[PDB]
Structure formats: structure tokens, C-alpha cells
Design a protein around this ligand. Structure first.
Ligand SMILES: [Mg+2]
Ligand SMILES: [Mg+2]
Lengths: 239, 239
DNA sequence: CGCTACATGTCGTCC
DNA sequence: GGACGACGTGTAGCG
């Protein structure tokens, strides 16, 4: 219980209980390979029949159950959940959330492996190429939109909704920008169109809105044009 | 190598290589506990400094790096990535993706554990309480909306966008339904408003929009009412 | 394929 | 905690 890893293949019940309870107490990552059934009831409800999966319980209460395919866990519980090991006909991992109230139950039919990983990580992800950096680029360099553009507000609450960037053009009109870091879609335009209408109701048909994205879908283009909105091609920047 | 699980702690390089290789060849699950750095370049770009993480490679190319917090992996590749282990100053897990071009590099500074899990699973998640089931309820029992409501289409592409349920009321108006399995937000009302307008272009004032959800956010109700759109409380059914 | 919209979305960020 | 919208979103499902 100093070693980063403690692992037992084909553990007995006592061994399982010992390692599971150590993981929670030491606040380390618990990892288990097991044949299991999963029961979930919560926001939604689901059953998963008997099969082999990887189970992870993070010290912050995150609970993940992974099949041999996809990116997503087949079942999970978010940070803050409370997990208890519980003995029955078979051992059962039980994770509870109260807000909203959700129960995840993992019945462990055969545990092939259980492990405790006392992980030491002080580092945080450093990410670039986001929408937030698109905004920064525009405020530092407003001409990537158009000559004379004057960015004024970032994330301005208008009446209903929140606008990515609000500014004025060389004609003095109010300008709404809707930024997308990737190819913009129908819902991008609906967002932009929604902000613009609300603002037009105040400042007149004067108000411009501009979709700022590396590209558009066919449908985005269509709706953008039918509503008299504009498109400025812009790539999300990378430090 | 007929055991369901193979585990090596503090492996040698050749031990590391052997198990990774075997994992990929056997369509097994690879799990690694390691101190590592992560370099990602793709749709966006990111850097993660030295820290302990759980690393998972699924047979379908899904690649997950997990820290001891949250529910999301800090770095990943989705199914379809091709992974390989390169011997550099340290071993490096690579994982290239095509369309779009993405590379994920995991530098293994110290591998505390490597494991091969030959997982056997034929079962698919059975979930209830979804939006699809709201839809099915509404076709089985249209009076949950209102009497004389006749549903016609589900997931119907109109010109721009795809409508959840489309039908008529007993007064001969066209009805758009927008469904949400959870509390409805501004996004939903924007969808609904958008569909109603497009439909009004063909059929004129004879279109009704209805938001169907268990409840609304403040802004949603604000926008709903402003636009003369309706609301019917409905909870997603659980079998 | 490209487009669209759901999701037990999750997560940040303001209030 | 509710509201609001981003995310390297993932993922289905249909043209
Ligand atoms: Mg926005
Ligand atoms: Mg919809």
C-alpha cells in the first residue's frame, strides 16, 4: 500500500473486498476486469446483460463501465457519486447520486482482476484551437472579420440568449458574431438568427450578424442566405 | 496466451512491447497504468505534462487517457484510430486517425502496469426513458398531446431541418412537435420556432408549434410565449 | 459520404 | 444550484 499498483488476478471475495475498500479509503483509482450485469435507474433507466467489461472508479466518485468497443462508457456515474461495495448472491458495486437521484448497480459475476492504482498527477491539460481563442484572436486583430470592425463585448447577455461577440462596423451598425471552431451547422445559424432578431427588435433592420467558422454545411448556407446573414471564413488558431 | 487476463507490473520494454502487440493482434483490451506525457494534434491541439494516468486501447481503435478526476478522458481517439508502439528514448503509443488527420502521442516515462484483457461480450445496452419513446407514446396515444391530434410523420425532413413529430389538429392546422426527454432549454425553442417558420412559408398562419417536455427553463418559456408557441408537459416513459 | 439532431451527454462559467 | 452554450464532443440514422 505504498506501491503505485496493487493487483490481484482471480481474487477471492476477501481479496476483492480488501482491495475495493482500500481504493476508496486511500482515494486511489480502482480498476476491475469482470463478467458483470449492469442496472441503472436515474434520469433514464437501462439493463445490460452478462458480459466482460472494464470498470473504473475514480477517487472523485466518477464511475465508468467500458465495453470492448466505442469511445463512451456503456454505463457510468458522474463525479460526486458515492460508491459502496455490497455483498449478495454475488458482490455488487453500487453507486448513488442524489441530485438528481441515480443508481448504478454492477453485479460482479466473475472478477478476473482487481487493482488499486495510487496515481499522482499534478498536471492540467493545455489546449489550443478553441472557440474562446477565436474570440481572443478577433479582439486582438478585428480585421480578420472585416476592415473597420470594432469588437466590444464578449459573451454579452442580450435579453434572451448570450452572444459570442458584439461589435460595430465602419457604418456604425451593431454586429453580432456567432463563432464555431468547426464546420458550422444549422443550429449555429439558428443561434445567430435568434440573437439578431432579438437585437433588431431594438436597433432596427440595421443589425448585422455574421457566422464565423472554418466552413458551413449546405443547410447552414441555405438558411443563412434566406435570412440575410453573412459568413466570414476563419480557422481556430493554435499556439 | 489462452488466459482471459495477462498482467505485468513494472514491465521490461520487451515485456511492454510483447503485451501491447499481443493485445492488438488478439483484438483484446489494453490497459496501462503509467507516468506519461501526452501530445495531441488534430481538430485541436493540446499538451499534458508528466503525470500518472490510466490508458485504455480498445480493439476498435478507441483510445482513452484518464486522469484520477472527472468522467471524461483528458485525451482520446475515437474508434478507427490505428495505434502502434514506437521505441524512442521512451516507448511511445501513437494512434493516428485519418479524416480528419489526428495524432495522439503518449510518451510512457514509467509503466507501472500493462495488461491484456481478452474480453468476451455479446450484450447490447437496453435503455428506456428516451426521446424515441416519447415519440412512440405519442403515436400510440396522440391524446397525450390533445384530443383530435393526428400524428403523421416522425423524424421528417422538411426543407431545412428535421422535425420530431409532424401532424394535424382537429381544427385542420399543421402541428410541429418538438420533444425533449429532459427540461427544455432555449436551444429547443429555437429548433421549434425554426420549424414552424419554415412550415408557415408553405401553409401560412395554419401552423402550430408545440414544445413537449417535462418542463422548461426560464428563458425557454420566455421565448416560447413571446413567439406564440405552446407547451405540453410530458415525461419520457420508462418500460 | 455529408448533414442533422439526440445524449443518462459532460463540463465550464456566470449568477 | 439554474441557466446557457461549448465540446477535439460521441453516436445514430437517413438522404
Ligand atoms: Mg455561441
Ligand atoms: Mg428535435
Amino acid at each position: 500500500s505504498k506501491d503505485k499498483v496493487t493487483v490481484i488476478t482471480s481474487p477471492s471475495t476477501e481479496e476483492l473486498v480488501s482491495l475495493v475498500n482500500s481504493a476508496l479509503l486511500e482515494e486511489a483509482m480502482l480498476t476491475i476486469f469482470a463478467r458483470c450485469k449492469v442496472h441503472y435507474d436515474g434520469r433514464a433507466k437501462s439493463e445490460l446483460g452478462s458480459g466482460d467489461r472494464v470498470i473504473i472508479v475514480k477517487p472523485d466518485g466518477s464511475f465508468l463501465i467500458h465495453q470492448s468497443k466505442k469511445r463512451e462508457p456503456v454505463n457510468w456515474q458522474p463525479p460526486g457519486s458515492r460508491v459502496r461495495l455490497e455483498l449478495r448472491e454475488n458482490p455488487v458495486l453500487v453507486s448513488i447520486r442524489r441530485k438528481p437521484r441515480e443508481t448504478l448497480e454492477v453485479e460482479l459475476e466473475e472478477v478476473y482482476m482487481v487493482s488499486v492504482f495510487r496515481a499522482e498527477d499534478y498536471e492540467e491539460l493545455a489546449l489550443t484551437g478553441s472557440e474562446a481563442e477565436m474570440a481572443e484572436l478577433i479582439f486582438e486583430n478585428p480585421e480578420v472579420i472585416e476592415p473597420g470592425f470594432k469588437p466590444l463585448f464578449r459573451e454579452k447577455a442580450i435579453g434572451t440568449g448570450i452572444v459570442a461577440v458584439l461589435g460595430r462596423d465602419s457604418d456604425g451598425n451593431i454586429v453580432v458574431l456567432e463563432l464555431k471552431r468547426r464546420r458550422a451547422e444549422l443550429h449555429a445559424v439558428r443561434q445567430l438568427k435568434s440573437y439578431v432578431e432579438i437585437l433588431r427588435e431594438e436597433y432596427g433592420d440595421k443589425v448585422r450578424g455574421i457566422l464565423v467558422a472554418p466552413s458551413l454545411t449546405s443547410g447552414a448556407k441555405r438558411l443563412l442566405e434566406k435570412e440575410g446573414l453573412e459568413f466570414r471564413k476563419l480557422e481556430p488558431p493554435k499556439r
